[PDB]
Every structure is written in C-alpha cells, then in structure tokens.
Amino acid sequence: QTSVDPRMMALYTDVTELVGIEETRDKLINMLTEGDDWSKHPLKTISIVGFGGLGKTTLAKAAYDKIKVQFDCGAFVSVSRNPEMKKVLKDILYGLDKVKYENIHNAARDEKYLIDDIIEFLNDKRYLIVIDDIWNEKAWELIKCAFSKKSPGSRLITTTRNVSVSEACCSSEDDIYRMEPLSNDVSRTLFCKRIFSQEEGCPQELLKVSEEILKKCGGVPLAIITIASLLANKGHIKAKDEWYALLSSNRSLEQMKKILLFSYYDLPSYLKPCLLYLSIFPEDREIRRARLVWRWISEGFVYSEKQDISLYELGDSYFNELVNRSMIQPIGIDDEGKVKACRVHDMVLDLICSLSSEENFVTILDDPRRKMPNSESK
Amino acid sequence: TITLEKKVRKGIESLITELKLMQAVLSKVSKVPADQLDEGVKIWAGNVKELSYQMEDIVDAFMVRVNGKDLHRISAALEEVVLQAKQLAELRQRYEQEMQTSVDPRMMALYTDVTELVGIEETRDKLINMLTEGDDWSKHPLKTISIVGFGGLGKTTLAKAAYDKIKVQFDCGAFVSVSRNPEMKKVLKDILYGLDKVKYENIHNAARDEKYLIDDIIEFLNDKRYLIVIDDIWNEKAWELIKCAFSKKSPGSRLITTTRNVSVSEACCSSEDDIYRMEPLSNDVSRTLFCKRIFSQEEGCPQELLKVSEEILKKCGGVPLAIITIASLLANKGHIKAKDEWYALLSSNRSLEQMKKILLFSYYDLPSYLKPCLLYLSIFPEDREIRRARLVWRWISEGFVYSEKQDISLYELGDSYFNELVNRSMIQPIGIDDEGKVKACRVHDMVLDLICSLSSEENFVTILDDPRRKMPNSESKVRRLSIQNSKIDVDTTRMEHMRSVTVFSDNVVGKVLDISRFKVLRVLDLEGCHVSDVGYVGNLLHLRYLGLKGTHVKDLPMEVGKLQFLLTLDLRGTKIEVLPWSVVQLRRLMCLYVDYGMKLPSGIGNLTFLEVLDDLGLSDVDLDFVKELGRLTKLRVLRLDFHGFDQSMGKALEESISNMYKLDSLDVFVNRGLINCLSEHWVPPPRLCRLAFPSKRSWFKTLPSWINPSSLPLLSYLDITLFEVRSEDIQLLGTLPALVYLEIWNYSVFEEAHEVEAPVLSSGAALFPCATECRFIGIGAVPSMFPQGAAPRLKRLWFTFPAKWSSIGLGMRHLPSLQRVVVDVISEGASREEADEAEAALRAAAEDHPNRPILDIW
Ligand SMILES: Nc1ncnc2c1ncn2[C@@H]1O[C@H](COP(=O)(O)OP(=O)(O)OP(=O)(O)O)[C@@H](O)[C@H]1O
Numbered sequence A: 001q002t003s004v005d006p007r008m009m010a011l012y013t014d015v016t017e018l019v020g021i022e023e024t025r026d027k028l029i030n031m032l033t034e035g036d037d038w039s040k041h042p043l044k045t046i047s048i049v050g051f052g053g054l055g056k057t058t059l060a061k062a063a064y065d066k067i068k069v070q071f072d073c074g075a076f077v078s079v080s081r082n083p084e085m086k087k088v089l090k091d092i093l094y095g096l097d098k099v100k101y102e103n104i105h106n107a108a109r110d111e112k113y114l115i116d117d118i119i120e121f122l123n124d125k126r127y128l129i130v131i132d133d134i135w136n137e138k139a140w141e142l143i144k145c146a147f148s149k150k151s152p153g154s155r156l157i158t159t160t161r162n163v164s165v166s167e168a169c170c171s172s173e174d175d176i177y178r179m180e181p182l183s184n185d186v187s188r189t190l191f192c193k194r195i196f197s198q199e200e201g202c203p204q205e206l207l208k209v210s211e212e213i214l215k216k217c218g219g220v221p222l223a224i225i226t227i228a229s230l231l232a233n234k235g236h237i238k239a240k241d242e243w244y245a246l247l248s249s250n251r252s253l254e255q256m257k258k259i260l261l262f263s264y265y266d267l268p269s270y271l272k273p274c275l276l277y278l279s280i281f282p283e284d285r286e287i288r289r290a291r292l293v294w295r296w297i298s299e300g301f302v303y304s305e306k307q308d309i310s311l312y313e314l315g316d317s318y319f320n321e322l323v324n325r326s327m328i329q330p331i332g333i334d335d336e337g338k339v340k341a342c343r344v345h346d347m348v349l350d351l352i353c354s355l356s357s358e359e360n361f362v363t364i365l366d367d368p369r370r371k372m373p374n375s376e377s378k
Numbered sequence B: 001t002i003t004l005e006k007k008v009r010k011g012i013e014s015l016i017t018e019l020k021l022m023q024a025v026l027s028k029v030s031k032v033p034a035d036q037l038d039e040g041v042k043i044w045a046g047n048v049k050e051l052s053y054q055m056e057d058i059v060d061a062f063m064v065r066v067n068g069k070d071l072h073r074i075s076a077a078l079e080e081v082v083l084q085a086k087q088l089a090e091l092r093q094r095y096e097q098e099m100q101t102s103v104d105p106r107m108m109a110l111y112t113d114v115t116e117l118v119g120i121e122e123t124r125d126k127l128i129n130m131l132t133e134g135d136d137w138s139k140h141p142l143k144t145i146s147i148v149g150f151g152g153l154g155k156t157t158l159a160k161a162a163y164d165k166i167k168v169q170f171d172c173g174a175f176v177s178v179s180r181n182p183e184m185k186k187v188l189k190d191i192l193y194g195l196d197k198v199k200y201e202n203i204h205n206a207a208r209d210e211k212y213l214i215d216d217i218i219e220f221l222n223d224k225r226y227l228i229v230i231d232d233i234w235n236e237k238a239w240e241l242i243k244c245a246f247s248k249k250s251p252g253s254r255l256i257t258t259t260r261n262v263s264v265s266e267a268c269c270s271s272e273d274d275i276y277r278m279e280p281l282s283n284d285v286s287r288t289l290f291c292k293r294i295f296s297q298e299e300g301c302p303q304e305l306l307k308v309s310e311e312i313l314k315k316c317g318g319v320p321l322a323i324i325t326i327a328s329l330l331a332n333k334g335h336i337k338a339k340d341e342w343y344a345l346l347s348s349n350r351s352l353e354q355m356k357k358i359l360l361f362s363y364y365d366l367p368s369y370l371k372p373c374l375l376y377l378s379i380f381p382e383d384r385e386i387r388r389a390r391l392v393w394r395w396i397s398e399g400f401v402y403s404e405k406q407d408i409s410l411y412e413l414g415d416s417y418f419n420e421l422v423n424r425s426m427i428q429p430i431g432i433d434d435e436g437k438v439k440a441c442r443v444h445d446m447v448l449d450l451i452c453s454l455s456s457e458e459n460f461v462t463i464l465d466d467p468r469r470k471m472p473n474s475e476s477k478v479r480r481l482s483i484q485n486s487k488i489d490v491d492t493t494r495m496e497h498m499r500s501v502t503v504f505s506d507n508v509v510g511k512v513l514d515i516s517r518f519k520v521l522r523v524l525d526l527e528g529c530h531v532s533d534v535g536y537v538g539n540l541l542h543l544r545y546l547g548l549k550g551t552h553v554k555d556l557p558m559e560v561g562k563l564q565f566l567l568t569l570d571l572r573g574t575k576i577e578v579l580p581w582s583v584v585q586l587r588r589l590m591c592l593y594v595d596y597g598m599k600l601p602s603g604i605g606n607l608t609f610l611e612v613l614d615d616l617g618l619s620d621v622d623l624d625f626v627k628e629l630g631r632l633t634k635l636r637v638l639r640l641d642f643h644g645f646d647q648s649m650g651k652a653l654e655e656s657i658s659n660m661y662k663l664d665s666l667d668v669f670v671n672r673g674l675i676n677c678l679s680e681h682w683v684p685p686p687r688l689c690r691l692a693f694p695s696k697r698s699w700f701k702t703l704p705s706w707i708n709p710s711s712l713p714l715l716s717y718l719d720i721t722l723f724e725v726r727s728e729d730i731q732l733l734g735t736l737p738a739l740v741y742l743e744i745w746n747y748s749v750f751e752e753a754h755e756v757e758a759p760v761l762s763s764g765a766a767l768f769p770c771a772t773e774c775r776f777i778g779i780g781a782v783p784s785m786f787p788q789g790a791a792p793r794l795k796r797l798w799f800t801f802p803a804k805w806s807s808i809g810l811g812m813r814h815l816p817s818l819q820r821v822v823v824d825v826i827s828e829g830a831s832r833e834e835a836d837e838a839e840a841a842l843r844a845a846a847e848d849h850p851n852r853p854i855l856d857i858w
C-alpha cells in the first residue's frame, strides 16, 4: 500500500520535551495581537520560512494552542506537495465544525460550492487559521478566495520552505518571520536531555567529540534529535572510539533522509544536475558563484533555444533559484553587485554525495574514506 | 521499363494509405492541451509531421511529371522515405515506458471585489431595463436574453452584476456554468442544488438518469417566478437538452445565457432584439482602468510615459483582460519599470500564462480541418486588413480545401470555412464586397501573437523581420516564407522544398532574391511589389496561384501553357495589353482577373471550370467569340464592359448568358445611350441573386418585362437607371419576395428637363417585405408610398421633395424601424418663404417619430 507522511507523528510529541520555545513563541504571539485594539484592525497574514527540520510547524502549533481561546473558530490544515484542492477545502470545513460538517468528506461538489460554504460559515466571526507546508503559488492563489470578504480581528498563519511563496502571501515584508537555528547552549541542553536524560552530566572524554558533533549538526533540531537517538542506543551509551567513528562517517536516519529529500524531488528537471555538481568541493569551505556559473556553462547544463538570450544571466537565474528554495546559504556581496559565495549544510552535503555516487556522476578521492570504486572502468 | 511503371504505382498507393493513417494520428494528438502531453509523444509527433511533408512531395511529383530519369528519381526517393519511416517506428518502440487536474482559471474572477470595476453602471442598467421593461413585466410570458462576444470581454461579470442587483424581486434563482465538454447530469444537479441548498443538499450523490432530474426541476418550479443564468455554452446540443426543464409556461420568469458563439445565441433567443452584443470599453474608461490598476493612488501618469502608454492602450484594444494583465506586468508591485523597459515590452509570469491559456480555448475547440486555415493568418503583417478572396484562393491552392462529394464547388466550401471562422468570434469582418459578401477581415493583436508563436513552433511559417523574428537558428527545411523587412538578405540555397513565397515590401531589395531555384512552388504572391518582368515563371510546373497585382509587368512569356495545374491567375493594375495565345491551353483554371483594356485570345471556350471571370473586354470581337462564351457552364460571377462592342449582336450574347444555369452576380457597364441587349423574352438564369448596372448615364426604357417575381424568385440587390419611371413600376418591385437592397435613378429628371412627379402606391399591403434600404434618387414621396404600414424593416430612406409641394403629409409613423433619412429639396419653383417652411415642417415630422432618425436636406 501507501505509506504515511513521516512528519505526521511529530504532531503528537509531548510538550515537555521542547527546549527553547518560550521566547520565539511569545514573539510570534505579540506579532499576532500587537496592541489592545487588535480585535478591531483588518485581517492580517503572517508567514514562516526556513529549511526543513527547523521547527516551523512546531512553533505554529504552540502559538495556536496558546491563543486559540480568544477567537470564535479555527482550523489547522496541512497542504502537501501535490495537493487536491477539494481535499484541502473539505479539511478546512471539517475543522471549523466537526458536528455540522461531519460527513463533508463524502460530498461530491466542485470547488465553487465548497468555497461558498466556507464564505457563508465565516460571516460575522473572528477566526484564526493556520495553513501549513505550502509548496508553490497556485495553491495559495486558489485558497485565498475563501478569505475574500473583510472581517475585523481575524488572523492567518502560513508556513513554507519557499521564499517567493511567503512574499506572495504577506503584504508587507515586516509580516515575515524567518526561523533561525538554536544557539549553542540550547542545542547542548537538548542533546544532553535527549541522551544523558537524568544525569545531564557529560563525561570528560566525550566533551570534544560532543563539540565537534554539535558543530556538524548546526543547530537544526531534526539532526540533533536523530544523532542523539543514534548515539543513545537506549540499552547502552556507545564507546568513545565509536563516537569518533560516527563523527568521521536505522529507522530515524531513514526518516531524516526521506524528509530532507522532499526539496530535491521537487526541483525542475534541468536543475537536478546543477545541484549534484556541488558534491565536488570540500566540506566546510565556501564556493565562489562565478566559478560555479562558468563551470555549469562549460559542462553543458545551461542552454536555450531563444535567439536573444545570454547564457550568463540564465546561469545566474539558476543560482538564484537554488538560493530561493532554501538549499544554499548565500554569503557576502560580489564586486559587481551580486552574491559572492555560498555555503551548504553538512547533512545535505552527505546526502548529495551519496546520490551523486550512486550514478557515477562524480568520483572523489580521499584516502581514509571514499577510495577508488571497486569495479568501475568508466 | 514495364516493370518499373508497375512498381511505382504500387508504392504510390501504399504512400497514400500511410498518409491517411498519419493524418488521423496527428489530428488525434493535436487536441490535448500542452499541459497534459508528455515529451515522448510530442517529439515523435514532430518527426511524423516532417515525414508527412516529404511523402506528400513525392506523391505530387509523381502526379505532375507522369521518362526514365523521372521514374528513376522517384523510385530512389520512394525507397529512402520508406526506410526512414521504418527507422522512426523502431526508434519509438525502443524507449517506450508506461510507468492531478487543475481548476478553470476563470473561476477566481468570480471573487474579485466589486469596487474594482470601472464602467459597469451604464451597461448594467441597460441590461436590467432589457429584462424588466415596463410595470407589468411580472405578467408577461417567459423571456430569454443572450450575450455574445469574444473571450475576456466581461460577459459573466455583467451577468453577475445584474443578477446580484435584481435577484430580490423573484422567488428562486441559480447561477450555473457549463464548460466545453459537459456532463448533463452535473449541470442538472447544479441547477437543483442552486435552487434550494437545504432540500437538495445531497443531490450530487444521487444516481438517476436525466429524465428524473428534469422531472424534479419541473416539479419544483411550479407556480414560482424564477431568474436563471446559464453561462459559457459552447454548442447547440447542450441547450437543446437543458431547454426541456423550462417547457411549461410561467408568467414573469427570466433566463440569461452567455456564450462566445453566435449561432448558439440565435438558437437561444426568439427575436433578434433579445441579443446583447458586448463591445469593448472606450478610450477614457480604458485609461482610467489602467491608471487605477497601476498608479493606483497617484493616478498621475508622468509625461515621459504618455506616448508609450497610448501605444500600449491602442494595442490592447479595450479588452479588460488584456488591460489588466499588461498593467500587472508593468506594475511590478515593488517598482514601476523604466521607460526603456516599457519600450521593450511594447515592441515584444503567471498572469500571462493564464491569459494565454484562457484565449486558447477557442483554438482547441475548432474542428480539425479548420486549424491550418487559422494558422495561415500569421503570414500577413500586423494591423492591416486582409481581402477574403485572396485568403480563399490561397487556401484552395495550398490544399486545405477538399471533399469527396461529386457535385460540390470548392469556392463555396472555402467561403463556408471563412464564415465559420467569423461565426466563432475570432475574426472581425469589415465592409461589403462587390459580389455581396464580406470584403476584408481584421485580427486582434494578442490573438496574432498567439497565432505566430503557435505556427512558429511547428515550422508552419517563417517570418523575416530584422529587429525581431530572424532566421531560425538551426533549421535546414523551411516550407513557407514571409518577407516583411527587405533590409535582411536571404540565403535560399538550403531551401529546396519551398511551397509558398510572399513579399510585402515596397522595396527594391525585395525583388533581389532569386526565385527560379524553388523548383517546387505552389503559391507565388508578389502583389504590390515593383518587379518588372518574370520570364522564369515557366519551368515551375507546380504552381497553383500566380498573383501579380499592382506590379510593373509589361508582358508574359509565351510558355505559361506548360502550367497544366494553375487555379488562379490575377492580372490587375499591370501594364499588360495583349495576353499570349497559349493561355487558351490551361485546362484547369478556375479564376481569371483581368482589366477590360486587355485583349483576350480567340479560343476561350476551352477554359471550362471557370467559376469567376472579371471585366471582359467585349470590344473589337466577332460572333464566334460571343458564341463560345455560352460554353462556360459552371460560372458564378461575370462582369462586362460593352465599350466598343457593337450593339447589333446582343441577342447572341443574351442567349449565351441564359445558357449558364448556376450564376449569382452579373454586371453590365455601358458608357452612354440606350442599352440594346437583354431584350424581353429572355428567361434569366434561375439562381440569380445580385444584379447591377452601375452606368448611371445609360438608361433602360420603361422597364424590363422579366422582373416579375416568378422569373427572379431570388434577388437581394438591384441597381437600375430608367429613362422615365411610372407609378406602377414600384408596384412590380413590391411583388419581389426578398429585394433587400434597391436603388433606382430617373434619367429624365437630371439629363433632360422633366420635373419630379409624385408616385402613388395602391392596391395592397406588405408591399416591401425585407427592404432595409431604398434610394429613390430622382423620385420621392413619404406617405403615399407606404400605405397601411408596409416595409416594416426599412432603416434608410432617400427621396427628393420639391419646395412647390409645401401645401400630402410627412408622417413617419407608418414605418417603425426608420433610423436615417436623406432628403434633397428643389427650390427654384417655390420661393424661399416656402423653402424654409417645408424644411422646418419635415424636421418636425422627423422629430415626432419615436426612433428619431437623422435628417439631411442638402
Ligand atoms: N525547540 C525544540 N525542541 C525540541 N525539539 C524540537 C524543537 N523544535 C523542533 N523540534 C523537533 O524537530 C522535529 C521537526 O520539526 P518540524 O517538523 O516542526 O520542522 P518543520 O519546519 O515543520 O519541517 P518541515 O519544513 O519539513 O515541515 C520535530 O520532531 C520536533 O520534535
């Protein structure tokens, strides 16, 4: 049969296991209400952006559960990558009132009548609605119709991985919240709590390997949690040399890989090679963009049939699109007014290296790891 | 050599069958919108198209040229093309692996805010008045209104506005939309659910046939007033079925329908007064919409942008969809773009994709045999207008028009194709031809861009402009070429397989390119160019259309007799005087345009199949010529000149004319004097439909006797100048059944010194059925002409009135439909004091009429 989205179980995680939410939760809550007469201003929309595994839907869920009391009706809907609009509208309706629209998932009407139902139900009410995991523009363009009328005091929240989608949702660029990774102390406490759960005392021999591992994670809660479960080995903590072996180099790991690969399976077909090409450069350094663009043009990944196009600006567009989908961190400003360099997360780099190795796209030569392929003549 | 002949025949028959199959497949493919095809099928279809072109060329070569060398070349080409076909088949089979739906883009527009519509109030109130129209509207029978126009014009918006405004004064209503390929069950369920959301709340899950749903609708509407809107009807069967639910009679109920097709609207409404034709916005309204959309708050356009703004607004054409999309494109909500960027856009995103997808519905709906005929319009320049006869003859020459019936003329098929294109609101017709049909046509500019892109993606047509649209980067096989900017230079050494060349340049460099190398041509069109002489027209052997109009050609090579296939030969405005004799030997020839100053050779009787002959000389000609004229039997248009023609032999000419059974139009031009032909006891052809004598200085005597409505049952046009008109001559014209148009001159009033005599009509009613215009130039009377109310369709009247008759009444209430009157007064007999008296009198007589026509005294 078909499997279920691995991100669904995370909605049933206990609340006493979240480390550093209070600050961000209260900041978002203040961004929503913001005043004493917030219940008299026009409808507002907030959006949250970042890369996968950063903790967006967790924060939205926290704020929603905290302040849902001060409204009349609300819902918490999730849109996937390839959505069916009927399903989304039925989900909204069933979330607004479980009794009246109890059998709404069996009705067979088109989108116009479902939108009319949503409009009629929301007349003269304050509502708080969260829409999750939007992946492109058409979906929002259609769902926006149900919130066309004006309603003083109502609020919308959306979460996404794509930046242009967030610019299209919100009106002002002050209504965008950018998720950012945890600090070092918070990450360390999460780690300890996750593994040394009760002692919360790290032995000394493990300190420096712990620090290098935490640096490799980068403050992303998903990676921290998965590696902590890997090293926990609930029966027994592993040995120091085994920690070293892991650093140099299961269900949770498969889940993390499957989750991160959503952004790769979503790219247009002409952008997949341009991404794998990043597995040529070493780990932590940064890459000049001009080098990348000229090498892409030389390899033959950039072409068009129009008569009046310059390949340089096509390549630049490809680079900006890769940055747009939150798969690359830009750094600095070039001497011609553009980005200077780019960085890549380390787990993403490992995924890319494995993907590109499974197809003879690139062969790397390190002595400890990644030696010559055993049986390959080409 | 006997064996070779037998083999080539077999190969050709095989190719013909294969061509049929390939065309079936391609037509099947070309229906799917581009978003549902996969790349494999698309690539394979392109290659199949190319092979089809090659095989057509081989078949044509065999048909024309049939010796040893020819048969050898043909056998070689046959073998090669068969091999290529097999190879492509294997290639497709090698990489075949088997391994949601979007929403209508027009749906979001129903949720647009109402404060963003600019100029609705007037049209909205006009439609509302067309619906109610009175105080007792709630007691008249059921009425149906329809709205027509092209896409993006604002039909459903207007319907929605009126509906929301007046829905209160009814009991029940609904707003349903039918798509292109509808399911009738879904439409009926939609109506039911719209009428009552509570009772029929779960109606979309019921599973009954159409009969029971129709019965439910009929039972619910019993004893109620309802207002129902039905949207986006695309053909006739849908309405034919939905009409059954509104079969009973219900006083006070109303229906509205909106559509893009004209025949559908004629089938919905009863009277042609219940049709609303949407028309684009004016210039001021369009400009305010533009500004509002972009400069939203300032509403102040900077000066440097004024003229580019005006050119852009002219290109949009007043269609709200285009205005809105281009305004969003130039807005760039972050920042208004720069002036040079505006220029770049003018010379040359989500909203743009949506607009293209919306406009392409009318293209994906055409029958398969009409899609090429539309793409062919991408050959002509942007804003000019196109003659329809040119189009029709070029379509026939290219091979787009064919049928298997035995008794059909391709000219009327082509005319039907043109009228169908006009019917679907994809072409704007302009003017009236000299044979009673449309003259020219225009195309919207965005539609033109869409057509150009579509036709370019398939090597259908290659255009040559220097700034944009240069030679294709990697293309060795070009079939149809269109030269518009003579600045470019052409290679024309790889273009072996041309089919059609057209030059639009007044420029000298236009005549520079060599033509004798295109050994396979079908259409040569040099109309307007300044070429001087063409001796290479022979040795082409494949032509079908030779268009030389308005060129400086002095004389033709006496080798045109070799072109055994030549449908059209157009010589007008050239400097030719005598046609070469070998012209007689063009057995397949269907159209001959020529000036009356050119000498035709003798044996013209051999040119059977002639369907159109223009401006015969008829001067310095013997009798056997006028007798030969009687052999062209299937001839539908004729024009004569009678210039030097001796009027002693008119009887033979009239017999030869009476011999042509199929015939529609006829002209006779005579300089002066009395016309000494077409005597009485003539028996005109039965199907005649248009007759004209544009002389205006050569009169008939009293009237031809053969004008009785039995001999000419069909007639919709007439133009005669009589010597002296009687009173019981207009009577005979009243007897004529159709007679849409009419124009009579009285020769004695002007050239002689006779005076205007008042004609009186008597003994009858309904004298002029279907007479929309009448110009009695030389004779006039308003009341006594039309007693009891006759000609209840007239719209323009021309008559003369002496000032003597100031002391007959000018009451214009006999005639309801009057809209325009043109008068001229003769003031020498009566004094000025009677003159201004009569002027004010007829002015008041025009003012009392409810329609309030316009006057002109002259
Ligand atoms: N502050 C935190 N403390 C502990 N765990 C956290 C915290 N924030 C997030 N997590 C954990 O991170 C995991 C993934 O987070 P989440 O799925 O909310 O990120 P996301 O932005 O929704 O990812 P995606 O963009 O793929 O939907 C969850 O299992 C959650 O338990």
Ligand SMILES: Nc1ncnc2c1ncn2[C@@H]1O[C@H](COP(=O)(O)OP(=O)(O)OP(=O)(O)O)[C@@H](O)[C@H]1O
Binding pocket: B106, B109, B112, B116, B117, B118, B119, B120, B150, B151, B152, B153, B154, B155, B156, B157, B158, B232, B260, B289, B320, B321, B324, B358
């Ligand atoms: N008077 C107006 N002012 C502003 N916008 C208008 C006006 N009329 C129409 N529009 C806009 O034009 C767009 C298309 O109009 P509409 O779809 O009603 O035309 P239509 O005749 O229904 O087209 P189709 O024949 O394809 O259904 C709509 O988005 C509407 O907002």
